[PDB]
Every structure is written in structure tokens, then in C-alpha cells.
């Protein structure tokens, strides 16, 4: 079920055989925890700067 909280996925939540499966925008790669996204780069799209 994605619809509880995007299946706690930080970006693209989806469902595979009744299992939410998180994913991410190019630039990112899914943390091991399968929920989050680790920028595999210094300027991942979508995050503002000041950082």
C-alpha cells in the first residue's frame, strides 16, 4: 500500500506484488533502507542550494 505515506518512500512510491517499492529521481540512488534517496551527486535535482 503506497497510500499510507507514499509507502514511506521519499520519492517515487509504487507497488510490486502488494509491496510498496520506493525509487528516485536521476541523481539519487535508494538508501539501503529502501525508503530514502542518496544523491549520488553534488547537485541532485530538487534540492535547493545554500546547501
Amino acid at each position: 500500500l503506497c497510500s499510507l505515506d507514499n509507502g514511506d518512500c521519499d520519492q517515487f512510491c509504487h507497488e510490486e506484488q502488494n509491496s510498496v517499492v520506493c525509487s528516485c529521481a536521476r541523481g539519487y540512488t535508494l538508501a539501503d533502507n529502501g525508503k530514502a534517496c542518496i544523491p549520488t551527486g553534488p547537485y541532485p535535482c530538487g534540492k535547493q542550494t545554500l546547501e
Partner: protein, 235 residues
């Protein structure tokens, strides 16, 4: 923009400004990647040469941050409709590539499905650009952003005195004096999700600015998502 606020530094980095042969900004663009800018098909109908300035915050002043990218090639959507701004979408590929930095980073394209389901069903999005600050006001010398609530379709459709094709969507206020305006077209409409900004629309057209009973209308990028990809193949 008509009433929102200046983007603080770092705040609106995917913002691009298309500029005329006189360095006057005439439209915007969302920075998709180092060589690509997403804009509105229609900002490019006059035809004369134009460039791209990423990194700008105040326009009455140059002051480092800026950079002008020469367009190497432009891909207008082929079913556009001057008469009705249908398919008002187009990508620009820069000759040289953008150097991401503070104030200069791209915005993420969402996954259609997730966008339609999770994104476009968020309560709002964020329009942004160097546009005049009032329907009959002047262009803003400073970059401004504005949070605009998604408006429901028929609600949109019945309020417009013109066609709302499914390649377009509505956003803003019925009455509140806040909206995007001339000079803002082709700018980003990005919807945020957990501190990530996904491109969800392009600043297209609209009856006046902030007019009671009217919304601003945006190109539904979530429907040129594949278009945008193939568009970045161009070889």
C-alpha cells in the same frame, strides 16, 4: 509574478531566464540538466535569436552567479496551437553546459504515474519568474516565487473563457490577488514533495493576472514527460 516574494538565495535554482538580443528577459525556463532548459513552445514564436541566463536574481544588476548559455537548438512541440496554446511546451539544448552551483541546480522530472497520483494531488505548487508584478504593472527586476493551489478541472474549465485542454491545468486563486503574469511564461511550476521539487507545469497563458474568478493556466508537463525525454535525444 503578482505577489509572492523574492526567492531567497539558493531558493529558486532551477529557474532560467530566456533573454532577447537586448538582454531583456522575455520568458522563463526550468533547468532540467546541464544542457537542457524546459520552456513554453510559444515564447519562441517571434523567431529572432535569444539566449539563456541561469543564476540571476536581480536584473538591474550583473553581479556574479549569472551565466548566459547560447541555445544550441530548440525543439518546439509539434502540435502546439497559437490559437489556443495547446501543447505549449518546448525544450532548448544549450551549446555549452550549465555549471550547477549555488542558485543553479536542476529540478527533477517526476514519474508520470507518481506525479498524477502523488504530486498533482498535493494542495499546491510553486510558480516563479521575473514577470510584471501586477496585471498592468511592470516586469520585476527581482526573481519571485509564488505558491499556487491546484484548482480542480471543471472548476478550472468553467471559470475559463477559453479551452482547458488536458495538456493544460489551472492554478491560483479565485479571488486572492496572487498569480503569475506577463514575463512569467515558460517558467517553472514545481510541486514539492519532502524537500524535493518536481517539475509539474510550465507557465503558459491566462486571462489578465489575478482577475477575480480566474486562475492562471499551466502546461501539464506530466503529459510531455515522454515527449521531454525523446526531446533530449535529438540525434
Amino acid at each position: 509574478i503578482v505577489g509572492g516574494q523574492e526567492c531567497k538565495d539558493g531558493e529558486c535554482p532551477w529557474q532560467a531566464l530566456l533573454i532577447n538580443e537586448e538582454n531583456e528577459g522575455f520568458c522563463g525556463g526550468t533547468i532540467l540538466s546541464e544542457f537542457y532548459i524546459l520552456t513554453a513552445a510559444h515564447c519562441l514564436y517571434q523567431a529572432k535569436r535569444f539566449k539563456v541566463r541561469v543564476g540571476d536574481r536581480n536584473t538591474e544588476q550583473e553581479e556574479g552567479g549569472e551565466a548566459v548559455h547560447e541555445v544550441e537548438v530548440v525543439i518546439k512541440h509539434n502540435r502546439f496551437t497559437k490559437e489556443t496554446y495547446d501543447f505549449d511546451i518546448a525544450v532548448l539544448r544549450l551549446k555549452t553546459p550549465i555549471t550547477f552551483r549555488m542558485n543553479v541546480a536542476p529540478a527533477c522530472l517526476p514519474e508520470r504515474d507518481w506525479a498524477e497520483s502523488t504530486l498533482m494531488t498535493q494542495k499546491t505548487g510553486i510558480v516563479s519568474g521575473f514577470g510584471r508584478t501586477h496585471e498592468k504593472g511592470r516586469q520585476s527586476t527581482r526573481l519571485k516565487m509564488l505558491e499556487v493551489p491546484y484548482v480542480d478541472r471543471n472548476s478550472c474549465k468553467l471559470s475559463s473563457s477559453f479551452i482547458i485542454t488536458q495538456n493544460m491545468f489551472c492554478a491560483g486563486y479565485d479571488t486572492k490577488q496572487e498569480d503569475a503574469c506577463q514575463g512569467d511564461s515558460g517558467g517553472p511550476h514545481v510541486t514539492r514533495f519532502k524537500d524535493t521539487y518536481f517539475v509539474t507545469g510550465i507557465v503558459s497563458w491566462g486571462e489578465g493576472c489575478a482577475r477575480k474568478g480566474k486562475y492562471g493556466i499551466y502546461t501539464k508537463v506530466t503529459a510531455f514527460l515522454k515527449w521531454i525525454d525523446r526531446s533530449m535525444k535529438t540525434r
